[PDB]
Design a protein around this nucleic acid. Sequence first.
RNA 1: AGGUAGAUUACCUGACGUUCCCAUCUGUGUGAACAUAAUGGUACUGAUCAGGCUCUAAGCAUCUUUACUUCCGUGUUCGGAUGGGAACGGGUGUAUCCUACUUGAUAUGAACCUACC
RNA 2: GGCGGCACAUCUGUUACAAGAUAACGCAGGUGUCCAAAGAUGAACUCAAUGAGGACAGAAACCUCAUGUAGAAUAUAAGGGUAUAAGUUCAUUUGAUUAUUGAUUCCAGUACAAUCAAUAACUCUGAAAUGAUGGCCUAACGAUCCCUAAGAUUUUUAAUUAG
RNA 3: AACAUCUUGUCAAACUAUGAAUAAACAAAGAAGAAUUCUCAGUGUUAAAUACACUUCAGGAAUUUAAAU
Lengths: 170, 57, 60, 165
Amino acid sequence: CKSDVMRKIKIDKLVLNISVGESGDRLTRAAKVLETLTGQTPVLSEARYTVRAFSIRNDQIACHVTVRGAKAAEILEKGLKVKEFELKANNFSATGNFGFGIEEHIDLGLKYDPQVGIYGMDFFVVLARPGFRVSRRKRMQDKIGRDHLLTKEDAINWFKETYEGIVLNK
Amino acid sequence: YVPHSATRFAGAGENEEALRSRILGGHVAAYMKYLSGEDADLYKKQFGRFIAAGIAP
Amino acid sequence: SKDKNRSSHNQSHKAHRNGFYKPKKSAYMSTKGMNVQVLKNTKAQRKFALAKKLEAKKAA
Amino acid sequence: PLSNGRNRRTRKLFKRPFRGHGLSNTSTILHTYKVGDYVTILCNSSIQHGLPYKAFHGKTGRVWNVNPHAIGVMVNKKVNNRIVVKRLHISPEHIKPSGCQKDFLERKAAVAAIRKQNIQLKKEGKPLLPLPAKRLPKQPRPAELIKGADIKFTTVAPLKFEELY
RNA sequence: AGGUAGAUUACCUGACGUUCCCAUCUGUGUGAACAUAAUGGUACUGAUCAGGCUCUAAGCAUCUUUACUUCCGUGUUCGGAUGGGAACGGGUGUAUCCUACUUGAUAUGAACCUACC
RNA sequence: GGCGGCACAUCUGUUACAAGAUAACGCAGGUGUCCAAAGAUGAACUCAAUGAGGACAGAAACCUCAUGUAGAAUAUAAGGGUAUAAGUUCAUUUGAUUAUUGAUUCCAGUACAAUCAAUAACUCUGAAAUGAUGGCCUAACGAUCCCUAAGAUUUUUAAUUAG
RNA sequence: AACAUCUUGUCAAACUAUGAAUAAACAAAGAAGAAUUCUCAGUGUUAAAUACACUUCAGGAAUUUAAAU
């Protein structure tokens, strides 16, 4: 009857974001690989501040998409697999989230063409526990208790107990 | 008498037969039979207390 | 030829010789601008009462 | 030299009370105003539509008309050497019931409570109670005797000066 | 005891931890259809396998805050009045009114209608 | 006096004295514009900033969580107002319309101008209560004569049939 | 150094939580000086009203009554 079932961590959101300093052509390719990997059309993020150093307002800089459920878990497995399940101890946020970056997207390897190109992708994983909806719903919004909230070490332990991926301290 | 418009009913599209089916539970008594034709355990998962009460679709 | 621009001197003494005139009671009993329905209701009864008073005068 | 704008010199008059911003009570929009009531005009700067003129702020007027959304308030305005009657139509947001007759309406009920028993005591033939005594300014206190059993004396004298520093 | 709608809008807030849940509420399962979005995360709908983990609510603290009372202090300031004092500057006395900050003590909600226990 | 300036029509804070009024060629500034949306309504969302994380990416590019009483934004000067909005995003729309009254501000209780409250139409938005007769409020403007536009079919008459 | 944090000294016509004194505008009984009891109508509000609103507290009759710093 122990309420530990109400305290089990579960990946509730996985955001993949690709950032490119130009809009057009290559942005469509960046959105194209995201569609193949996940299966849903991404959202093209537009710049908020124009800076001539980066050659960037209304122009769309980056694209991103989030996946939840079994799709997020299987996509995350590839990202950790290509990372050899090696995650440094500084990657984990104080709020219980973590992330990393992927240089080469495997996607398709046989028919890779310069038209598609090569793209670097980042993976950010948001962890959650049952009951987090109280801060997300529309009626009677509150704040999750501190003891229920995830910290850095709960996320680190979860990564070790679910994928056996050791942590790097150096 | 309650002021209203018929644009946010279960119809507001198609006709009164679409609204009548939802009011009479036709949408409910079409997922029970849909689930039965898909998976037995999925049927018992969602409508478990309906088999216990013997309420056929 | 500059001159003094303004002064409230002697103004209160002047205003109190013939002191602040109050409005009469009939100023507070004006009806213009009242509710439309209330005016409609009042007019209906006044017409009814007057017509009933006048038939008594004809009777006697 | 001020300007002649409608809301001139209203930095502090139209400022909301400290920790009192935002929406107001619902008793403001639920209070029932009837013709002849006493109200206080209070310009609520949170509502800019129908804001009464700043010269009427804090004045006590009487209800002379009740409309679907606004309340007809009647106030006296001082002009050159006369007083004129001003008839405003103000939404209930900018007015407030007045307690100017709170004490008087109690005295009205106190005398009517005694009058009710009087018409009943007259039927039984017993003497009838008198009406409550009228209010008087603080009257000279009468001679009173103070017992010496629980009395204590404390001498009062000028005090030796001590430098604060 | 709980839930709905409230009125007063911190005695009601914020942080740190604690206590139950029998009903109720919540969190909870799912995505076929109404409907929804980049995402069944939200909103929507269908449901009941589990749970007091969170929310909510009740209480804890030499808790911040807020709310009453004393004190601050008749000290600041002030209305009226000299052929009063002073070279000025400013400051009495008289008949009166009299804050604020701070500090200390106490409190941490009261209360209305409907339903269910 | 001239030269300068506009204190000449005008708005905000202050001088200004806790009702109203309120001086100086007193102080710090502003107006002659701008908007088919920046007007109307509905829904969803929360802003500035900071902390911690994520390939290039670094003090500044974009993504995520947490804190966040407005410290942002709201065409503009300043002052007020605003957080399930008055800000941001999306959607529909033209009430920025016609006609008749009674008030409030300036006030001589004159005009112009502004601020309202209602009534009769016809509409817009919303499930609905409502809301909408321009802009969140306080400035953004104009008589006689002359020129130039729009409107006066809701009804009233006459002649000839039938009674 | 800088940043937090606890203190310390001194300030604002265009800063303010708080906030007087002096003031401003109300009330202290005029549809004609009160009140009560009975009877009671026309419109409208209202789901309907006998509730409510206005109508000389529509109107009408008795009793009491000159009081209200």
